[PDB]
Structure formats: C-alpha cells, structure tokens
C-alpha cells in the first residue's frame, strides 16, 4: 500500500495523512449461462435454398421464431459474397437471443445491391425495400446467375418503377393499378452480363430485441446456477457481474427483467426454472492508506471504505463505521486527532511503535463550580501575541 500511495501521489516521499489510492472490487467465481431450452433448429434452409425467389416489389417476410439458430453456418460457410450486419456483429450474433427474426427475401442487380443498407435511396430502396434508420440485422446476398437468368432472357424478377411517394421502412406494396405506365418493370437477365447486371439472391435477417422473452437463440448451452456468491452471467443475453440472490420481488407472469433508476437490471427471471433472482452487485469501495510520514515510518494501515470486515480478503482488523481498518490497533484511550479516519475515529503512530486507532478526545473535561454567590476574578494577566495567516492573492496566469 505504501508503494501504491507513492505511485498515485507520483512522489517518493509521502507525507502524513490518509490517501485514497484505488478501488476494491470482489471478482466473479464463475461464468453462468442460462438460455431458453429450445431444441428446434431454425428453418433458414427454406429461404437460402428455396428453388425460386420472389420479385423484389413483392419481397417475402418469413417469420423465424421459437427455434435455435446457428449463424456461423450462414456466415463461415462463405458461399456468399456480401454479409453486412447492422447493429449486431456477425460474430457475437451466435452469442445472442432475439425475440423474433424476420427473413426478407428477393433478387436484384449486383449494382443495385448497394442500395440495401439503412439510410439509403434508389430504385430498390425507394420503391421496393427500405431498411429503417435503427435497423438491427444482416444483409446476406450471393450471386445467382446460375439460376436467375437465361439465354434469351429471364423475366421473372419484377421491381416497382413508379410510386406516388417513396416506401416507408418495411412497407410492402404489391398493387398494380396504372400510374401513363404500368407501375412495375422487370429485369431482363442474361448470362453474358457483367458482374453488376447479373442477378443476386438477397436474404435480409431483420432481428428484433424487445422486452419480450426471446424465442430465437444461438447454440450456446446453459450452465448450472449458483447463489449467494459472486458470478458472471448471461441470461438470454442479459450480461453482467453480480451476487445472484433468491428474489422475493413479486414479478407478474409476463415480466422478464426488473430495473434500477440507472436502467441497470435489478432482478431477472431464470429462463428455465422461471424463478426471480436479485442482481445486487458484487461489493466495492475505495481503499485509503493511512500513513505516518515516510520520514517517520514505512508502516501503514489500510481502510476499506464501507466494506465489512467479513468481506476483505491482518494481525489487527477493526470495523469502524467508515469501513474495515487493517493494520491499526484500536486502543481504548482517547487523544487529539492526528490522521482523521472518520465517524469519531482517528489514527496515530504511537508505542515498539505502531499505528493506533482511537476515539478522539474533544477536550479535557471541567466542572465550573458555579454557585449563586461565588465569583472568580483574575489577579494577574498574560499578554498573548498570536499569528493569523490569511491568503490575499494567487499567481497571475494567462
């Protein structure tokens, strides 16, 4: 602790005092994982391996839910070519659970693919498929010139050419009344086209992360649960460090989390036993080193502020109301305050020398011997000359 004061004060001498150095923090004994116990593998096959896709004016939203996913299959297999994941990482995607997943599917030109991102405009974005500003999801697309063209032309892939106003995000509009023009037009796809005019199949996985119980989750397997002990945890994605305690908080059957004023999560429903657990944090506080002057002694005592002496990981240990004090001995005598610890306790270097801690004396105690017919009158005087020092100015800076 003395070296830590020297290093926090950036000085090789330390003067007499109590110095806050560093913060104590108890650490997680293990990493719990608790997840939905869902066996059903998610049916993404019947989008990525559908025979024929929809036209992008008529883009199709397959709901994926109450299933277990593995997006490392979709990613690392890398038969694809573009895989832009917005608001979620392609990797941490396997470590997370989603309330629903919506798979949005269509075919477009390899040029016009560059329009399908949040905050974009153009033929496809304006009239066919618009991604919202706060979209969470992965745009996955791959070349399909093996299936979606022919010599003499394929004409299967219609897009809306005209609308009275641009689409809203995720708006679907399959209307065909004349705009004069028929409002739809189609890609003539031939094999001999260049990379940008060839067809590409697109599947956009629109994730959502609502307060509902998450129904899709990645492949990780739940651990056992331990209590009245500090742990790291993952609970359907809710991740933190805490002393999981059996909660008496009376959650209504729809509720999954409980929250603090800071929007930390205060209690959680177990995703398998459905019990409620408190997540009070693993304990912490400032560490203050009581030191005499280093020109007096290298011997030091340490105060774990607010921490209870049962918690701190030693020849003397004393529980002040300011916190646990280690390495100073409580003496029942009382003296003038030397180093203030707090809550009536002060510490000093005294006899064989060591740091004592003690209740401070406010002063010597006197009974004035008042009586209804007694007066004390001074028969002499002393002339006292005392110094009072006041600051008046400080160093002028520009």
């Amino acid at each position: 602790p003395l070296s830590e004061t020297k290093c926090t004060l950036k000085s090789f001498t330390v003067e007499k005092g109590i110095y806050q150095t560093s913060n104590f923090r108890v650490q997680p004994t293990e990493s719990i994982v608790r997840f939905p116990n869902i066996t059903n593998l998610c049916p993404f096959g019947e989008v990525f391996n559908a025979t024929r896709f929809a036209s992008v004016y008529a883009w199709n939203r397959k709901r994926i839910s109450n299933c277990v996913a593995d997006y490392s299959v979709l990613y690392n297999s890398a038969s694809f070519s573009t895989f832009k994941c917005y608001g979620v990482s392609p990797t941490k995607l396997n470590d997370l659970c989603f309330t629903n997943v919506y798979a949005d599917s269509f075919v477009i030109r390899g040029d016009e693919v560059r329009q399908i991102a949040p905050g974009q405009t153009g033929t496809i974005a304006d009239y066919n498929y618009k991604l919202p500003d706060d979209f969470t999801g992965c745009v996955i697309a791959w070349n399909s010139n093996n299936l979606d063209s022919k010599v003499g032309g394929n004409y299967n892939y219609l897009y809306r050419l005209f609308r009275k106003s641009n689409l809203k995000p995720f708006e679907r509009d399959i209307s065909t009344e004349i705009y004069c023009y028929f409002p739809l037009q189609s890609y003539g796809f031939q094999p001999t086209y260049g990379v940008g005019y060839q067809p590409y199949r697109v599947v956009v996985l629109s994730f959502e992360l609502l307060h509902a119980p998450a129904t899709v989750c990645g492949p990780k397997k739940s651990t056992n649960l331990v209590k009245n002990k500090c742990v790291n945890f993952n609970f359907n994605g809710l991740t933190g460090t805490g002393v999981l305690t059996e909660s008496n908080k009376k959650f209504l059957p729809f509720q999954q989390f409980g929250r603090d004023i800071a929007d930390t999560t205060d209690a959680v429903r177990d995703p398998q036993t459905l019990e409620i657990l408190d997540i009070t944090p693993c304990s912490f506080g400032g560490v203050s080193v009581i030191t005499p002057g280093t020109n007096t002694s290298n011997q030091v005592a340490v105060l774990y502020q607010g921490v209870n002496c049962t918690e701190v990981p030693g020849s003397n240990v004393f529980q002040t109301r300011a916190g646990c004090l280690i390495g100073a001995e409580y003496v029942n005598n009382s003296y003038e305050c030397d180093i203030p610890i707090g809550a009536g306790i002060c510490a000093s270097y005294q006899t064989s020398q060591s740091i004592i801690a003690y209740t401070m004396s406010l002063g010597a105690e006197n009974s004035v011997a008042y009586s209804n017919n007694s007066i004390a009158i001074p028969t002499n005087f002393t002339i006292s000359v005392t110094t009072e020092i006041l600051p008046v100015s400080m160093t002028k800076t520009s």
């Binding site: 209804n372 017919n373 007694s374 007066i375 004390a376 009158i377 001074p378 028969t379 002499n380 005087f381 002393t382 002339i383 006292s384 000359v385 005392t386 110094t387 009072e388 020092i389 006041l390 600051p391 008046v392 100015s393 400080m394 160093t395």
Partner: protein, 118 residues
C-alpha cells in the same frame, strides 16, 4: 481596518483574549496579523452580592463588582482584582433593600463625613 487601524470589541476576531492591538507583516501572497491580546490569569474565588443594603438604600456598583474577602466587602473591576472600599463615589443608589434577590449588609462610606468632621 478593525485590528490594525483600530481596537476591536468583536470577540475572537483579532485573536483569543481581549484585543489590544495588531501588527501586519507581509508574507508571500498573503498577510500575517500578529494579534496582541490581554488574557486574564491567576483568578481567585470571592463571595459576591448584587447590592449592599445601607440605611435601607440599595447600593449598586458604578463600574465594577462587589466582592468579599471573608470578612469585608469591596468593590473591584471585573477583569483585574483591585479591591477598593465601598463608597458613595463608586456606588449608586436605587430603591429600598427589599426588591433585590440576594442583597447583603455592609456600610457604604461617605467621604464628605470625615471631611465635615475635619
């Protein structure tokens, strides 16, 4: 202003004890006031009374306190024991003896008496 250019009646404003005077000394970025104060010392207990009853008049001290040394009554200044005989010139009359809680009986000297007698 109040300690150097003057004498202060304000308690503890210009040091502990009764302020006599102060001296300024310059310091880096600040000022040192050397405060000179009268601090009372070597006190003694005395029996005291608010008033002397004499000839049915209640006498009170003009600028002091009544004290007794065990046999006699004196008037003295509050902050330095200088005992003086109780006289018409250092006491003032107000009313009869019955209204004051704790009046005591002693003669009050009149210096005009032995002068008229001499």
């Amino acid at each position: 202003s109040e300690c150097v250019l003057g004498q202060s009646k304000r308690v503890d404003f210009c040091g502990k004890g009764y302020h006599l005077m102060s001296f300024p000394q310059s310091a880096p970025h600040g000022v040192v006031f050397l405060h000179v104060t009268y601090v009372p010392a070597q006190e003694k207990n005395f029996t005291t009374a608010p008033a002397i009853c004499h000839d049915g008049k209640a006498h009170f001290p003009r600028e002091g306190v009544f004290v007794s040394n065990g046999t006699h009554w004196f008037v003295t200044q509050r902050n330095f024991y200088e005992p003086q005989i109780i006289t018409t010139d250092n006491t003032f009359v107000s009313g009869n003896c019955d209204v004051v809680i704790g009046i005591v009986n002693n003669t009050v000297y009149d210096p005009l008496q032995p002068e008229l007698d001499s």
